Design a binder for this molecule. Sequence first.
Ligand code: K
Length: 528
Amino acid sequence: DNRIKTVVILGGGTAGWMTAAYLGKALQNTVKIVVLEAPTIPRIGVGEATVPNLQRAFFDYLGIPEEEWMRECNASYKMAVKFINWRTPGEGSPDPRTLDDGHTDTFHHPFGLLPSADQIPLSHYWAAKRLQGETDENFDEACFADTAIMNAKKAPRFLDMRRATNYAWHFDASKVAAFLRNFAVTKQAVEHVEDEMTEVLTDERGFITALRTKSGRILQGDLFVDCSGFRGLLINKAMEEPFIDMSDHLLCNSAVATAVPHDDEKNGVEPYTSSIAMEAGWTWKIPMLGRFGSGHVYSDHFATQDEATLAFSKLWGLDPDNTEFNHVRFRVGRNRRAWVRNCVSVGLASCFVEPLESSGIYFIYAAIHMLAKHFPDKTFDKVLVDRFNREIEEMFDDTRDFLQAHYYFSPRVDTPFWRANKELKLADSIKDKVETYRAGLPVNLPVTDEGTYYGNFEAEFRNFWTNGSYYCIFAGLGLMPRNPLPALAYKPQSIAEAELLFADVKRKGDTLVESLPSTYDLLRQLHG
Ligand SMILES: [K+]
């Protein structure tokens, strides 16, 4: 028996309890699991957004129904990230300004794969018509019916819970973590030790043999998972793995957040996350029932905590001296290696980017999934560790580049922050993709249908940011192809077939906007 016998997870929150619950299922009762988590001082719940695979890849794996967990964390529905004021100058405002060309400064990044005609995505037929003046429609409204549903604030399900569209979730992270702790302790026999870590004990090879807690108790184990957050108490301190700072790619390094009571009856509930451009970063808005989480992400090189706090307060008309605020300084980048010896980092201890595309929980689920597949024995085969590390670094570096593109192709030059973004270097892989896009070609064409894509985690993981996503961001920000895809000039029958697809998107939008309940009414039914 060369097998791991005990796994010790350092830290709770979403990373620790997701790791514990998932390995609890994956390891089929053959391994003892211990979580060491300090008792937490409650923070105001500032909200978290997600991607659509979360229910199939995580909660369904555990046998937890959607309704059951949503009801315990005041969850709500997300059909997109909506970008506001990313092309126009001025102070932070929740209200979209007007472009020079008359359009409102808003664009959406929704979920779902674009349809095709003649093996060409609908994106390309839209681009051809827009470049030739045959349409004035934006990409998002021409190509996704979700745009019209979100503009009317309708829900992504009917009141009988029939599905109408793709969606993800908004929720209180600290409640999801509590829900998962309860699940893991009562249904999977995870041991919860409520204490702080004071020592990390190592053998002659530098492998961890145990942690000591503040009370003096020693927790022995074979494999250690670092979910300790930005401090990286195992991976960075004890194992001495360097963190690669990537502030030469992304500038924001701080946030100030709160939760804002909201009149759902008067205003309705928006089925989407908003990203509101500010003078020295951007502000998230994550609606739940009765409230929204909000947070201004900023670079402390271009604004002081007080400046940021004032600009954030002015957005929502908060009184800055009579408001509860959380302040965070973050690490941007990743570890040189995520897994060293018998220490595997997951969550913030591993890697982090600002939540501009709701990547946080995804990075956790992906790391845990890959750990279960690369799960070691006590010989810790180096190839197994290497392959895991290689997946984590490519996943992170890919999303990092995608995020950088949101900033680099903003036309804003009104503040030193917006201008500073354009003096950073683009990474090679994203320069290559921009060039491809600019010639009218697709970037990262989806391999498969939407069922298979959101059904099989490996299919999404290998094609996470597809053609549709690059169009949403580049076209949204005003970067167009230099010309249409030249093949389209030879394909009049394919042009006409795409016209039918555009008409289908319009019909679906008009029909569903008439018949769907409001997001508010679906939430009221769900939360009982
Ligand atoms: K051991």
